[PDB]
Coordinates of C-alpha atoms and ligand atoms in Angstrom, one line a residue:
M1 CA -306.2 -34.8 80.3
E2 CA -307.6 -33.6 77.0
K3 CA -311.1 -32.1 76.5
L4 CA -313.9 -34.3 75.0
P5 CA -314.9 -34.0 71.3
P6 CA -318.4 -32.6 70.4
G7 CA -321.3 -34.8 71.4
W8 CA -319.3 -36.8 73.9
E9 CA -320.5 -37.3 77.4
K10 CA -318.5 -39.0 80.2
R11 CA -320.4 -41.4 82.4
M12 CA -320.0 -43.9 85.2
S13 CA -321.3 -47.5 85.1
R14 CA -322.9 -48.0 88.5
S15 CA -322.5 -51.8 88.3
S16 CA -318.8 -51.9 87.8
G17 CA -317.6 -48.4 88.9
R18 CA -316.1 -48.1 85.4
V19 CA -316.1 -44.8 83.5
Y20 CA -317.4 -44.9 79.9
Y21 CA -318.2 -42.5 77.1
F22 CA -321.4 -41.9 75.2
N23 CA -321.9 -39.6 72.2
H24 CA -325.2 -37.9 71.8
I25 CA -324.7 -37.2 68.0
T26 CA -323.8 -40.7 66.9
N27 CA -325.1 -42.8 69.8
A28 CA -321.6 -44.3 69.9
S29 CA -320.6 -46.0 73.2
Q30 CA -317.2 -47.0 74.4
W31 CA -314.8 -47.6 77.4
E32 CA -311.8 -45.7 75.9
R33 CA -311.7 -41.9 76.1
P34 CA -312.4 -40.5 72.6
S35 CA -309.7 -37.8 73.1
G36 CA -306.2 -39.0 73.8
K37 CA -306.1 -41.7 71.1
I38 CA -304.4 -39.6 68.3
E39 CA -300.7 -39.1 69.1
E40 CA -299.8 -35.5 69.8
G41 CA -296.8 -33.7 68.3
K42 CA -297.0 -35.2 64.8
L43 CA -299.2 -34.9 61.7
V44 CA -300.8 -38.0 60.1
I45 CA -302.5 -37.3 56.8
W46 CA -305.0 -39.4 54.8
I47 CA -305.3 -38.8 51.0
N48 CA -306.5 -41.0 48.1
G49 CA -303.9 -43.1 46.2
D50 CA -304.7 -41.4 42.8
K51 CA -303.6 -38.1 44.3
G52 CA -300.1 -36.6 44.5
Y53 CA -299.5 -38.1 47.9
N54 CA -295.7 -38.3 47.4
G55 CA -295.7 -34.7 46.4
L56 CA -297.7 -33.9 49.5
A57 CA -295.1 -35.8 51.5
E58 CA -292.4 -33.4 50.2
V59 CA -294.3 -30.6 51.7
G60 CA -294.4 -32.8 54.8
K61 CA -290.6 -33.0 55.0
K62 CA -290.3 -29.3 54.4
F63 CA -292.6 -28.9 57.4
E64 CA -290.4 -31.3 59.4
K65 CA -287.1 -29.6 58.3
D66 CA -288.4 -26.3 59.5
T67 CA -290.2 -27.3 62.7
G68 CA -289.0 -30.7 63.7
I69 CA -292.6 -31.9 63.6
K70 CA -292.9 -35.2 61.7
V71 CA -295.5 -35.4 58.9
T72 CA -296.8 -38.8 57.8
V73 CA -298.8 -39.3 54.6
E74 CA -300.9 -42.4 54.3
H75 CA -303.2 -43.5 51.5
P76 CA -305.4 -46.3 52.7
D77 CA -308.1 -47.8 50.4
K78 CA -311.7 -46.7 51.0
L79 CA -310.5 -43.9 53.3
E80 CA -313.8 -42.2 52.9
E81 CA -315.4 -45.2 54.6
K82 CA -312.6 -45.6 57.1
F83 CA -312.4 -42.1 58.4
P84 CA -315.9 -41.9 59.8
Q85 CA -315.5 -45.3 61.4
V86 CA -312.4 -44.5 63.3
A87 CA -313.0 -40.8 64.0
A88 CA -316.3 -41.6 65.6
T89 CA -314.2 -43.4 68.3
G90 CA -311.9 -40.4 68.5
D91 CA -309.1 -42.1 66.5
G92 CA -307.8 -41.7 63.0
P93 CA -305.6 -39.2 61.0
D94 CA -305.2 -35.6 62.0
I95 CA -306.0 -34.4 58.5
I96 CA -308.3 -36.1 55.9
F97 CA -308.2 -35.2 52.2
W98 CA -311.3 -35.9 50.1
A99 CA -313.8 -34.2 47.8
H100 CA -316.0 -31.9 49.9
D101 CA -319.2 -33.9 49.2
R102 CA -318.5 -36.3 52.1
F103 CA -317.5 -33.7 54.6
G104 CA -321.1 -32.5 55.3
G105 CA -321.8 -36.0 56.5
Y106 CA -318.6 -36.0 58.6
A107 CA -319.4 -32.6 60.0
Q108 CA -322.9 -33.6 61.1
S109 CA -321.5 -36.5 63.0
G110 CA -319.1 -34.2 64.9
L111 CA -316.0 -35.5 63.2
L112 CA -314.5 -32.3 61.7
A113 CA -313.2 -29.3 63.7
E114 CA -314.3 -25.8 62.6
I115 CA -311.2 -24.3 60.9
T116 CA -310.1 -20.7 61.9
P117 CA -308.6 -18.9 58.9
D118 CA -308.6 -15.1 59.3
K119 CA -310.0 -12.8 56.7
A120 CA -306.5 -12.3 55.1
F121 CA -306.1 -16.0 54.4
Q122 CA -309.7 -16.3 53.1
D123 CA -309.0 -13.6 50.5
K124 CA -306.3 -15.9 49.1
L125 CA -308.8 -18.5 48.0
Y126 CA -311.8 -18.2 45.6
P127 CA -315.0 -17.6 47.6
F128 CA -316.8 -20.4 45.7
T129 CA -314.4 -23.0 47.1
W130 CA -315.0 -21.8 50.7
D131 CA -318.7 -22.4 49.9
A132 CA -318.0 -26.1 49.1
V133 CA -316.6 -26.5 52.6
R134 CA -319.2 -24.6 54.5
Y135 CA -321.6 -26.8 56.6
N136 CA -324.4 -25.2 58.6
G137 CA -322.8 -21.8 58.4
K138 CA -319.3 -23.1 59.5
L139 CA -316.1 -23.7 57.5
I140 CA -315.3 -27.3 58.2
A141 CA -312.3 -27.8 55.8
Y142 CA -309.6 -26.1 53.7
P143 CA -310.4 -26.2 50.0
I144 CA -307.5 -27.3 47.9
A145 CA -308.5 -27.9 44.2
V146 CA -311.5 -28.0 41.9
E147 CA -312.1 -31.4 40.3
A148 CA -314.2 -31.5 37.2
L149 CA -314.3 -34.4 34.8
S150 CA -313.3 -33.7 31.2
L151 CA -313.4 -35.5 27.9
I152 CA -309.9 -36.7 27.2
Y153 CA -309.2 -37.6 23.5
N154 CA -306.5 -39.0 21.3
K155 CA -305.6 -36.2 18.8
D156 CA -304.0 -38.7 16.3
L157 CA -307.0 -41.1 16.3
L158 CA -309.5 -38.2 16.7
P159 CA -308.4 -34.6 15.7
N160 CA -312.0 -33.5 16.0
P161 CA -313.8 -34.8 19.1
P162 CA -317.6 -35.3 19.0
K163 CA -319.7 -32.5 20.4
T164 CA -322.6 -34.8 21.2
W165 CA -323.1 -38.1 23.0
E166 CA -325.5 -39.0 20.2
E167 CA -322.8 -39.2 17.5
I168 CA -320.6 -41.5 19.5
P169 CA -322.3 -44.8 18.5
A170 CA -321.6 -44.2 14.8
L171 CA -318.1 -42.9 15.6
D172 CA -317.4 -46.2 17.5
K173 CA -318.5 -48.1 14.3
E174 CA -315.9 -46.3 12.1
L175 CA -313.2 -46.7 14.7
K176 CA -314.0 -50.4 15.0
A177 CA -313.1 -50.5 11.3
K178 CA -309.6 -49.5 12.5
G179 CA -309.5 -52.0 15.3
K180 CA -310.2 -49.3 17.9
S181 CA -313.0 -48.1 20.2
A182 CA -314.5 -44.6 20.4
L183 CA -314.9 -44.3 24.2
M184 CA -314.0 -46.2 27.4
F185 CA -314.4 -44.9 30.9
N186 CA -314.9 -46.2 34.4
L187 CA -318.5 -47.5 34.5
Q188 CA -318.2 -48.8 38.1
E189 CA -318.2 -45.4 39.8
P190 CA -321.3 -43.2 39.5
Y191 CA -318.9 -40.2 39.5
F192 CA -318.1 -40.9 35.8
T193 CA -321.6 -41.7 34.5
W194 CA -323.3 -38.9 36.4
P195 CA -322.5 -36.1 33.8
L196 CA -324.5 -38.0 31.2
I197 CA -327.2 -39.1 33.6
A198 CA -327.8 -35.5 34.8
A199 CA -327.3 -33.9 31.3
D200 CA -331.0 -33.6 30.4
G201 CA -332.4 -31.1 32.8
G202 CA -336.0 -31.3 31.6
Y203 CA -337.3 -33.0 34.7
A204 CA -335.0 -32.7 37.7
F205 CA -332.9 -29.6 37.2
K206 CA -333.9 -26.6 39.3
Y207 CA -333.6 -23.3 37.4
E208 CA -334.2 -21.5 40.7
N209 CA -330.7 -22.1 41.8
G210 CA -329.0 -24.2 39.1
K211 CA -328.9 -27.4 41.1
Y212 CA -329.9 -31.0 40.1
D213 CA -332.7 -32.1 42.4
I214 CA -331.3 -35.2 44.0
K215 CA -333.5 -35.3 47.2
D216 CA -337.0 -34.2 46.2
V217 CA -337.5 -35.4 42.6
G218 CA -334.3 -37.5 42.7
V219 CA -332.8 -39.8 40.0
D220 CA -336.1 -41.3 39.2
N221 CA -337.0 -38.9 36.4
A222 CA -337.3 -38.9 32.6
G223 CA -334.1 -36.9 32.1
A224 CA -332.0 -39.3 34.1
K225 CA -333.8 -42.2 32.4
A226 CA -332.8 -40.9 29.0
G227 CA -329.2 -40.6 30.0
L228 CA -328.9 -44.0 31.6
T229 CA -330.8 -45.6 28.7
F230 CA -328.3 -44.1 26.3
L231 CA -325.6 -45.5 28.5
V232 CA -327.2 -49.0 28.5
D233 CA -327.8 -48.8 24.8
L234 CA -324.1 -48.1 24.0
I235 CA -323.5 -51.4 26.0
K236 CA -326.1 -53.5 24.2
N237 CA -324.9 -52.2 20.8
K238 CA -321.4 -53.1 22.0
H239 CA -319.7 -49.6 21.9
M240 CA -318.9 -50.1 25.6
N241 CA -318.5 -53.0 28.0
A242 CA -320.4 -53.1 31.3
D243 CA -317.2 -54.4 33.1
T244 CA -314.9 -51.5 32.2
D245 CA -313.4 -49.9 35.4
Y246 CA -310.8 -47.2 36.0
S247 CA -307.9 -49.6 35.3
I248 CA -309.2 -51.0 32.0
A249 CA -310.2 -47.6 30.7
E250 CA -306.9 -46.1 31.6
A251 CA -304.8 -48.8 30.0
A252 CA -306.8 -48.8 26.8
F253 CA -306.5 -45.0 26.3
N254 CA -302.8 -44.8 27.2
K255 CA -302.1 -47.7 24.8
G256 CA -303.9 -45.8 22.1
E257 CA -306.5 -48.6 21.9
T258 CA -309.4 -46.2 22.4
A259 CA -310.0 -42.7 21.0
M260 CA -311.5 -41.2 24.2
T261 CA -311.8 -41.6 27.9
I262 CA -313.4 -39.5 30.7
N263 CA -311.3 -38.6 33.7
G264 CA -310.0 -36.0 36.0
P265 CA -306.7 -34.1 36.1
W266 CA -305.0 -36.7 38.4
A267 CA -305.0 -39.0 35.4
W268 CA -303.1 -36.6 33.1
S269 CA -299.8 -37.8 34.6
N270 CA -299.9 -41.4 33.4
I271 CA -301.0 -40.3 29.9
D272 CA -298.0 -37.9 29.8
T273 CA -295.6 -40.7 30.1
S274 CA -297.5 -42.9 27.7
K275 CA -296.9 -40.2 25.2
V276 CA -300.3 -40.4 23.6
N277 CA -300.9 -37.0 22.0
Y278 CA -304.0 -36.1 24.0
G279 CA -306.4 -33.2 24.3
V280 CA -308.5 -32.3 27.3
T281 CA -311.9 -30.7 26.2
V282 CA -315.6 -30.1 26.9
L283 CA -317.8 -33.1 27.6
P284 CA -320.3 -34.0 24.8
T285 CA -323.9 -32.7 25.0
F286 CA -326.9 -34.9 25.3
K287 CA -330.3 -33.9 24.1
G288 CA -328.9 -30.5 23.2
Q289 CA -327.7 -29.9 26.8
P290 CA -324.2 -29.8 28.2
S291 CA -323.2 -32.8 30.4
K292 CA -323.3 -31.9 34.1
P293 CA -320.5 -33.5 36.1
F294 CA -320.8 -33.3 39.8
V295 CA -317.8 -31.2 40.6
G296 CA -315.7 -32.1 43.6
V297 CA -313.5 -29.7 45.6
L298 CA -310.7 -31.8 47.0
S299 CA -310.6 -30.6 50.6
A300 CA -308.5 -31.0 53.8
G301 CA -310.5 -31.4 57.0
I302 CA -309.1 -31.6 60.5
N303 CA -310.1 -34.4 62.8
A304 CA -312.3 -33.1 65.7
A305 CA -310.6 -35.5 68.1
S306 CA -307.1 -34.4 67.0
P307 CA -304.7 -32.8 69.5
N308 CA -302.8 -31.2 66.6
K309 CA -305.4 -28.8 65.2
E310 CA -303.0 -25.8 65.4
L311 CA -300.3 -27.9 63.9
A312 CA -302.7 -28.8 61.1
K313 CA -303.7 -25.2 60.6
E314 CA -300.1 -24.0 60.3
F315 CA -299.3 -26.8 57.9
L316 CA -302.3 -26.4 55.7
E317 CA -302.3 -22.5 55.6
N318 CA -298.5 -21.8 55.4
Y319 CA -297.0 -24.9 53.8
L320 CA -299.6 -26.6 51.6
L321 CA -301.8 -23.7 50.4
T322 CA -298.9 -21.8 49.0
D323 CA -297.6 -21.6 45.4
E324 CA -294.6 -23.9 46.2
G325 CA -296.7 -26.3 48.2
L326 CA -299.4 -26.9 45.6
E327 CA -296.8 -27.2 42.9
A328 CA -295.0 -29.9 44.8
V329 CA -298.3 -31.8 44.9
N330 CA -299.2 -30.8 41.3
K331 CA -296.0 -32.1 39.8
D332 CA -296.7 -35.5 41.3
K333 CA -300.4 -35.7 40.2
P334 CA -302.2 -32.7 38.6
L335 CA -304.6 -31.2 41.2
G336 CA -306.8 -29.5 38.6
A337 CA -307.8 -25.9 39.1
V338 CA -306.5 -25.0 42.6
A339 CA -308.4 -22.9 45.1
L340 CA -305.4 -20.7 45.7
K341 CA -305.8 -17.6 43.4
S342 CA -302.1 -16.8 43.0
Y343 CA -301.2 -20.4 41.8
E344 CA -304.4 -20.9 39.7
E345 CA -303.6 -17.8 37.7
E346 CA -300.5 -19.6 36.4
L347 CA -302.4 -22.9 35.8
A348 CA -305.3 -21.2 34.1
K349 CA -303.0 -20.6 31.1
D350 CA -303.0 -24.3 30.6
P351 CA -305.8 -25.2 28.2
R352 CA -306.3 -28.5 30.0
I353 CA -307.1 -26.4 33.1
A354 CA -309.3 -24.1 31.1
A355 CA -311.2 -27.2 29.9
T356 CA -311.5 -28.4 33.5
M357 CA -313.1 -25.1 34.6
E358 CA -315.3 -25.1 31.6
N359 CA -316.8 -28.5 32.4
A360 CA -316.9 -27.4 36.1
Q361 CA -319.1 -24.4 35.3
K362 CA -321.3 -26.5 33.0
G363 CA -321.5 -29.0 35.8
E364 CA -322.3 -28.4 39.5
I365 CA -320.3 -28.2 42.7
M366 CA -321.6 -31.2 44.7
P367 CA -323.9 -30.8 47.6
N368 CA -322.4 -31.8 50.9
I369 CA -325.7 -33.0 52.5
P370 CA -325.4 -35.9 54.9
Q371 CA -327.2 -38.2 52.4
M372 CA -324.5 -37.9 49.7
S373 CA -323.0 -41.3 50.7
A374 CA -326.4 -42.9 50.3
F375 CA -327.1 -41.1 47.0
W376 CA -323.8 -42.2 45.4
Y377 CA -324.4 -45.8 46.4
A378 CA -328.0 -45.7 45.1
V379 CA -326.9 -44.3 41.7
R380 CA -324.0 -46.8 41.5
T381 CA -326.4 -49.7 42.1
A382 CA -328.8 -48.4 39.5
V383 CA -326.1 -48.0 36.8
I384 CA -324.5 -51.4 37.6
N385 CA -327.9 -53.2 37.6
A386 CA -329.1 -51.4 34.4
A387 CA -325.8 -52.0 32.6
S388 CA -325.7 -55.7 33.3
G389 CA -329.3 -56.2 32.2
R390 CA -330.1 -57.3 35.8
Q391 CA -332.7 -54.6 35.8
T392 CA -334.3 -52.3 33.2
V393 CA -333.6 -48.5 33.4
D394 CA -337.0 -47.7 35.0
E395 CA -336.7 -50.4 37.6
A396 CA -333.0 -49.6 38.4
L397 CA -333.9 -45.9 38.9
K398 CA -337.2 -46.6 40.7
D399 CA -335.4 -48.8 43.2
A400 CA -332.5 -46.3 43.4
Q401 CA -334.9 -43.5 44.4
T402 CA -335.7 -45.1 47.7
Ligands
LIG501 O1 -318.4 -42.5 42.3 C1 -318.9 -42.0 43.5 C2 -317.8 -41.1 44.2 O2 -317.7 -39.9 43.4 C3 -316.8 -39.0 44.0 O3 -315.5 -39.6 44.2 C4 -314.5 -39.2 43.2 C5 -313.5 -38.2 43.9 O4 -314.2 -37.0 44.2 C6 -312.3 -37.9 43.0 O5 -311.4 -37.2 43.8 C7 -311.7 -39.2 42.5 O6 -311.0 -39.8 43.6 O7 -312.6 -40.2 42.0 C8 -313.7 -40.5 42.9 C9 -314.6 -41.4 42.1 O8 -314.1 -42.7 42.1 C10 -317.3 -38.5 45.3 O9 -316.4 -37.6 45.9 C11 -317.4 -39.7 46.3 O10 -317.9 -39.3 47.5 C12 -318.3 -40.8 45.6 O11 -318.3 -41.9 46.4

């Protein structure tokens, strides 16, 4: 019989003589034993579909060829919503891949095991990536790659990309004279509009530690209002459409219909085959200030209820987080600037990667506070409601902030 995951208490129902389980962290109650659900002797991995999951699977076969231990890569939709649901019952994948921002929430709920890399392995990764996966003093995941949004532009349509958001409206005008658009990017996910929204740090940026104040002052401030108003105004003046998602933006750029998009390194792959001559460069400034994308560190956390933690450790440390492991993933979909020093040193020669790190260091590594999931949803609603005209910018942001 396996040991119980953190927070779990085993109990007896006096009325039926039936054992049940109660979790003091999540208040979850159930008849099935939380441990013992995840199958032992194999590795099941969840990663997002836009990532190099097929490349990750190659590392999985390499692991199986060497060890006999099967590795299974799955990419469900909304895995960031599904993992906490199942793992809170003791079920789910052994390893979950996602940006670090959601791991703090997972960690507080007792869903992620503390990882145990020794000092020698820690030296192999940049310390700032270990910081992204530290929750309440504990390392709760293996950092993989640094994800910063960059301005991606068509070199043929636009040899000299705009340095400011402000000059885009007029640029869109003279590109419409060509039957083109200046800029199209996913307006449905707050991840993509945030760099503009946070740009102006006049009201909510903390110079004490270089962090945007999302919990005290919050998104209801004049700086965020200016950013979202500029966004809405591009839409009213018809330089952007409120309905543009990832799919639409991607297609239009890779068909050369628009001069610019905003996206991460995972997107480079599809552009490469489209053979648009593209550049990856710094995001435009707004109000004299650099855009501040929330930077994600794609991380691999281990399920607290998993019986394969040492399997997971071996796989992540000695197969994935190597030069040949990351390359296998990187060739499938570009990871961005990796956490592994030795591999990143080769990638840093790539100007696209230099551009990624440049936007990263102008932006901010996301907080991993438990509230991140609520924050993202609040901002998303505000943007969507402001952009559709359903609310004004003040109202949208007032309601967003609580
Ligand atoms: O839009 C909110 C969303 O932003 C981030 O998600 C990114 C993710 O980090 C990237 O790896 C890529 O998959 O695009 C996502 C945006 O669609 C946050 O990590 C996520 O928690 C948040 O919901």
